[PDB]
Amino acid sequence: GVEIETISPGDGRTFPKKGQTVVVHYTGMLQNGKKFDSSRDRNKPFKFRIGKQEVIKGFEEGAAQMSLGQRAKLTITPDVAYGATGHPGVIPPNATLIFDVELLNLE
């Protein structure tokens, strides 16, 4: 599943909803610390839509438990990421993924 370790609290009231556009900064790492993706390098927020299957399952599941202004470390098991196949490029089979995520806005 998804483990959430809070670095900075959100308001604890305002969470992502169906029909909303989620606006976040994120950085994705393997367990060994290596980066595979980021929004922070381009220095601009990344947007994705709840329920629209635009990101891996674990990432959305984690974000949906975050409130406005929260920054957290999401630990995501392979079965809700890329699983036994991994993905072309950095991500190997059975990769538990680490995401540094900040929930900036909901549009």
Residue numbers in the entry: 1 to 107
What does the report in the manuscript say about this coordinate set?
The human genome encodes two homologous 12 kDa FK506-binding proteins, FKBP12 and FKBP12.6, which differ at 18 residue positions. The primary known physiological function of FKBP12.6 involves its role in regulating the RyR2 isoform of ryanodine receptor Ca2+ channels in cardiac muscle, pancreatic β islets and the central nervous system. Similarly, both FKBP12 and FKBP12.6 can bind the immunosuppressant rapamycin to form an inhibitory ternary complex with the protein kinase mTOR (mammalian target of rapamycin), which plays a major role in regulating cell growth and cancer progression. X-ray structures at 1.70 and 1.90 Å resolution from P21 and P3121 crystal forms are reported for an unligated cysteine-free variant of FKBP12.6 which exhibit a notable diversity of conformations.
A survey of crystallization conditions for the cysteine-free variant of FKBP12.6 yielded two distinct crystal forms, one belonging to space group P21, yielding a data set at 1.70 Å resolution, and one belonging to space group P3121, yielding a data set at 1.90 Å resolution. The peptide unit linking Gly89 and Val90 at the tip of the protein-recognition ‘80s loop’ is flipped in the P21 crystal form. In the P21 crystal form the backbone ψ torsion angle of Gly89 is −131°, compared with +2° in the P3121 crystal form. Similarly, the backbone ϕ torsion angle of Val90 is −68° in the P21 crystal form, compared with −128° in the P3121 crystal form. In addition to reversing the directionality of the hydrogen-bonding interactions for this peptide linkage, the side chain of Val90 is significantly displaced. On the other hand, similarity in the backbone trace is recovered within a couple of residues on either side of the peptide-linkage flip. Regarding lattice interactions, none of the atoms in the Val90 side chain or in the peptide units on either side are within 5 Å of any atoms in the neighboring lattice molecule. These considerations provide credibility to the anticipation that the flipping of the Gly89–Val90 linkage may be significantly populated in solution. Likewise, the positioning of the side chain of residue 90 in this crystal form of FKBP12.6 closely follows that of this FKBP51 structure.
